[PDB]
Amino acid sequence: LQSVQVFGRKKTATAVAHCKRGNGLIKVNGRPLEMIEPRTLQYKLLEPVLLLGKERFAGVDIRVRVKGGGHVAQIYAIRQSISKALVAYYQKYVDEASKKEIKDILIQYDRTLLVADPRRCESKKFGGPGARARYQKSYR
Amino acid sequence: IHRIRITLTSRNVKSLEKVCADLIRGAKEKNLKVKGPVRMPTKTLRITTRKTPCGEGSKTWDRFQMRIHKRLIDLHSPSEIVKQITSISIEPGVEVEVTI
Amino acid sequence: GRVRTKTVKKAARVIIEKYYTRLGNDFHTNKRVCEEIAIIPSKKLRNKIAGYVTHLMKRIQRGPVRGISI
Amino acid sequence: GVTVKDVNQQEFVRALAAFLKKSGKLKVPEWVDTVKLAKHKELAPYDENWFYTRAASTARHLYLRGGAGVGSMTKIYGGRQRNGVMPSHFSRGSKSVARRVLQALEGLKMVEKDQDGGRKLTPQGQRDLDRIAGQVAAANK
Amino acid sequence: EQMTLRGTLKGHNGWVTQIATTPQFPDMILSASRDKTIIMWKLTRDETNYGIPQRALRGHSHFVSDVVISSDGQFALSGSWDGTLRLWDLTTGTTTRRFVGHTKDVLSVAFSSDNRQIVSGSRDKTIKLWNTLGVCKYTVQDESHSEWVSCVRFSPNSSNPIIVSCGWDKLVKVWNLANCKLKTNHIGHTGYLNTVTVSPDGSLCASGGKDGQAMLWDLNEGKHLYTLDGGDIINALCFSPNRYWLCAATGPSIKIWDLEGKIIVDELKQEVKAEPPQCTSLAWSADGQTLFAGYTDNLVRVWQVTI
Amino acid sequence: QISKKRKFVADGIFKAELNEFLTRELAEDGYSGVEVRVRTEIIILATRTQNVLGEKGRRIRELTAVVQKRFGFPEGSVELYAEKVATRGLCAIAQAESLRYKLLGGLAVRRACYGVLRFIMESGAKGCEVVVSGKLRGQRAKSMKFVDGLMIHSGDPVNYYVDTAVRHVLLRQGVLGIKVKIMLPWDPSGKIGPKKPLPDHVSIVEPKDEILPTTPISEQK
Amino acid sequence: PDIKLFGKWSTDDVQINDISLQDYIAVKEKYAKYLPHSAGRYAAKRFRKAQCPIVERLTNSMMMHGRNNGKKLMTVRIVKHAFEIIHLLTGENPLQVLVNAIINSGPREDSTRIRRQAVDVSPLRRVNQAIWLLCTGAREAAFRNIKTIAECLADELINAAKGSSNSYAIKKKDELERVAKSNR
RNA sequence: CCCAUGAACGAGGAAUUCCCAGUAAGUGCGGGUCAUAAGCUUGCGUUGAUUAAGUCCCUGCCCUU
RNA sequence: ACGAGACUCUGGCAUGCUAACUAGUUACGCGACCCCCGAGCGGUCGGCGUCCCCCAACUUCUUAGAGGGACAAGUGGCGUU
RNA sequence: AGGGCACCACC
Ligand SMILES: [K+]
Ligand SMILES: [Mg+2]
Ligand SMILES: [Mg+2]
Ligand SMILES: [Mg+2]
Ligand SMILES: [Mg+2]
Ligand SMILES: [Mg+2]
Ligand SMILES: [Mg+2]
Ligand SMILES: [Mg+2]
Ligand SMILES: [Mg+2]
């Protein structure tokens, strides 16, 4: 029984990928990875598989459960969780060399595939509609 | 015996944690099966109000808040033993509710 | 800016003048030594003092320093 | 093996609506040609057979998430209400439409009342939806 | 016999703080690091790389300060600045046991000869004796060092079972393992101490630290034998398993002394306004032909004893 | 049954009203504060507990009776006790009341303020500030400030290092305002001052001078 | 595995003729991405936007005016359809067309108005202003017209790449450089 | 709430406001007010940029002679 | 010496610690449905249950306590250095 | 006369 559970975050969206020894299945909330909406950003989800090849994923089944945030943030959380889950599975049940090479590929393409973006919404302050904008000022 | 649930509530985290630790230490000394302190989400009561008593000047606001922290402890013990354990000195500001 | 105030600078100078033999060029060891030998109320202040201690130790190894009399 | 979650949901809804209309045992209210589906709508639905589409959508939602009542359905089909010169706000769907859809689905025996309240799919309804999903997958392939 | 540079191991992302080798597996070594991981290296000795990272042991919250390998080569014992010790199953790379009780950074760990006991020295100025199940059998704090306990070691000779400890109070102490009571107290050094090592025969104990002097003590006699001069701060001391040598990591360089002649055999200097990387740890191979040295540039260097 | 939010707000409101009532009732008796420990025990801190107790406890019994009647406690459930303030000179409320009654007694403003300042400083405070505002001399109003020692104004440490009190004095010509601020000394024990030191104060341990060994010496234990 | 934008357009054959702009038009190699949507922090530091892929910079500049603020999925779809239209109309690589349009639209000399004085224009500002002019021309062509925004963007890019005077960006660049010459 | 009625307004002169990163802007949701109740305010998330890393030209404030 | 800074709250990190039927995960058992084909250690399930007479392990996700973590600390350049 | 600072100044 070889499995890992690795999360990825984007804003308030959090996706946990369970990656176990398998035949190459990838699901998000029980749906095929190609069925996740919006499909404008389908390549964002497919990027880990396109970069690493289907051969790396051929030996694992990955099921992703995602919640919170919005549509785009969930897309980014899913892709980050898939990449981090594959890296963790490789570093735990395969050699360190394979983990290093796949991690290098992912990092070279995009660092957010492995490292979470820490940006969060800034608090509103009184005297304006938002964090920085102020209400219009009149003089006469 | 009976299953005893102790709910502790406070506005002071440090005193709340001290009381919880003392209760768990007492339960351990009495050799009781005690579920650790389950921490409920902290409640933040907020009141935002204008600073000025009149209506003049730059519209500045005070953001007052109160934080309520809640803990749960589960015990399998007789009621008398539970009361004896809860009879220890309780720090001020901590409200304890025992249910059987 | 990263200008350290007189609190940090004076604490670092006194620490170096009193415990020069236990200090070195390693920030983390200096931080442990500072927290062992001084009461510094906050972790951030401890880190700033240890960092300036490390900087001054490098300067002292490179040559004499006016502020510190060892 | 094909289940609902394996197919495109819009295509599945269209196929299931066509299946319900072809079966023709679904009870349709007399006022389907007069009403609009919510107070935040401006016009009645463009599709004359909107009732079958709504029933298929409701059955799919019950498949995905059982125990939903009329209030949950009105939340599902709610949308943005524009208020003229005033800001827009969320608004719920028509309770009569949701209730009639649920009752018609119960009449088809695809839907039964849940023990804890609300509605759920019967095993027959689950089987019908999975067969429709298989047909959709076959058509796509 | 002059040692030459053979290769480098480039896995770590922080200072290499300790290197461990075992006689059972000549192709496997361990390296602890400040990147909070312990790398198990498989030695290929190929043209491309001398060795590559085989496995990474993770679970420490702070710097890993010291690592040792069990006699059978199946388990590893590590200490860390997070104040805990960990026992690792090398086959799976998971932690089998956690040792808690030190209130500050754990600076040194050591296995007994039969691996039935574990000794740990920490910044809390306390020495702790444990069993393999993670229970602190004994805690020496009354007669212990007045400063950080920087290194603790076990004697390999079971005839006189003793523990050798060195701390930042410039003292070397000997403890009777039977009762964990002080036996000998050495007051030679003038600066804080970084390391104490014991000869394979158990007769010799070498101590080194800030003052740069490597002082030899007779464990049987209980007296100071002599003193060797190292230019820089001594970071690590190691006795050659077969040759009558003493190896010291003096600043950026490595000095080997022939104890028979008390003279320098060789000086291992890395080929270069920045200070050179410091050597932090030394470990001889099982056969004694290969010396592994850890440095502050996140590298391990391999020196081969060449005729 | 009542929600926890409402329960905590209600307990706070009860303490606020009780403190206000005791402030108005026992101002001349040196009242400084009240502690409510749940029978419900109510501890009244005062400089002159004899006047709080009254003739054979008559006044304290009256206070217990009115408290019980107003707040709806069951008869006999609430008990009131009186205690003396440990360091009268370090209580801002006590000093403000003392200054208020000195001013009501016709004492000169400068004399009364300087007397209070000297008493506070002799009590062990790091520093103090006394501000008296109003129609001190003539119709035009002004404020006189008397400061001594160290005083901090900004940041979190003000919350636990500075004790503040504001009081009103009803004179013939109008109201005078009294503000008393006392910077408490650092007390590791925690009795007269905060245990936590000032956050920007770094205290460096003086090393113990030691003699380095000239020659290696070994001892046997 | 070669990476093609939208899975259709390759970057290997794209050539940047102007050597001054070669360091400020990120289009190939490490800058080849499947989509013009990276959610990167290119505005964190100065000059870092030079690393942002040029297609994504165009997509960002299409999110105007206010009513379209933040609708990056819509602008990505617009750019995809515009590239499809460009390929149909010209037979060329849409990336090559975009690069040529930017090169031809960037003004090389401007006036600073300190009476005005002529000054040179840095390559980064050249790229910035080229993108701004192209997007502005497309938007103004599409406003109050049955022609869609994707078609207007495709026409603007094609004309700018050809250097034709039918391009809003080309006309604005010519006016700016003429004024700079006058104030020289 | 329903049916019906279907005005100005086709991007706004002189002038002028706010703002640099999860920010501006778009978008909705809570709290306060509240029997009835948000075009206000105070918070929250969601989508998410262009431009700049400079200056004393304007408006001010400050320092020296 | 006050003010600035320090400070308090907040945001971001921890597969390390503490530990949860008013949070969950994974595993297993039962059940529903799809695929005869390639019917399985299959797929989907916010369907039920597993300290709660007795029947399962854990804390990644959630909550919230303790501690850690960042110091212009490392390298290069400029600077009176 | 010279020198600083600020999207409640400008660029
Ligand atoms: K149009
Ligand atoms: Mg906003
Ligand atoms: Mg809706
Ligand atoms: Mg201060
Ligand atoms: Mg401040
Ligand atoms: Mg109002
Ligand atoms: Mg956790
Ligand atoms: Mg203005
Ligand atoms: Mg302007």
Shape of chain G: globular
How many individual β-strands of chain B?
Answer: 5
Bin the strand percentage of chain G. Answer: under 5%
The helical percent of chain B reads 25-40%
- β-sheet strand percentage of chain B: 35-45%
**Could you give the distance between the termini of chain B?**
10 Å
CATH class of chain G: Mainly Alpha
Helical fraction of chain G = 40-55%
The Rg value of chain G, from CA coordinates, equals 16 Å
What is the CATH H-level superfamily of chain B? Answer: Ribosomal protein S10
Shape of chain B: elongated
Largest beta sheet of chain B, briefly? 5 strands, antiparallel
PDB class: ribosome
Keywords: SARS-CoV-2, ribosome, Seattle Structural Genomics Center for Infectious Disease, ssgcid
Entry title: SARS-CoV-2 nsp1 bound to the Rhinolophus lepidus 40S ribosome (local refinement of the 40S head)
Chain A: 40S ribosomal protein uS9, RPS16
Describe the structure.
The structure is cut from a larger assembly and holds seven protein chains of seven kinds. By secondary structure, chain A is α+β, with helices and mostly antiparallel strands. Chain A has one domain (2-140): Ribosomal Protein S5, domain 2 (2-Layer Sandwich). Chain A contains four helices and five strands. Chain A has a five-stranded mixed beta sheet with strand order 1-2-5-3-4. With 141 residues, chain D is α+β, with helices and mostly antiparallel strands. In chain D, α3 crosses α4 (95-107). A four-stranded antiparallel beta sheet of chain F has the order 5-4-7-6. Chains B and F meet through β4 of B and α1 of F. β1 (38-39) of chain C pairs antiparallel with β8 of chain F, so a sheet runs across the interface. The structure holds potassium ion (K) and magnesium ion (8 copies). The site of one magnesium ion has 2 residues of chain F, from loops. The structure holds three RNA strands.
Attribute tags:
part of a larger assembly, 7 chains, B: 100 residues, alpha+beta, Alpha-Beta Plaits, 5-stranded antiparallel sheet, 2 helices, 25% helix, E: 307 residues, mainly beta, Methylamine Dehydrogenase, Chain H, 4-stranded antiparallel sheet, binds potassium ion, binds magnesium ion, RNA-binding, ribosome, SARS-CoV-2
Architecture blueprint of SSEs:
The structure is cut from a larger assembly and holds seven protein chains of seven kinds.
Chain B: E1 3-10, H1 13-29, E2 34-39, E3 43-50, E4 61-76, H2 79-86, E5 95-99
Antiparallel strand pairs in B: 1-4, 1-5, 2-4, 3-4
Chain D: H1 9-23, H2 50-64, H3 70-76, E1 79-83, E2 86-91, H4 95-107, E3 111-113, E4 119-121, H5 123-140
Antiparallel strand pairs in D: 1-2, 3-4
Helix pairs in contact in D: 1-2, 1-5, 2-4, 3-4
Chain E: E1 2-9, E2 16-21, E3 28-33, E4 38-43, E5 51-57, E6 64-69, E7 75-80, E8 85-89, E9 94-99, E10 106-111, E11 118-122, E12 127-130, E13 136-140, E14 149-154, E15 162-167, E16 172-176, E17 181-186, E18 193-198, E19 204-209, E20 213-218, E21 223-229, E22 234-239, E23 245-250, E24 253-258, E25 263-269, E26 279-284, E27 290-295, E28 300-306
Chain A binds three RNA strands through β1, β2 and α3.
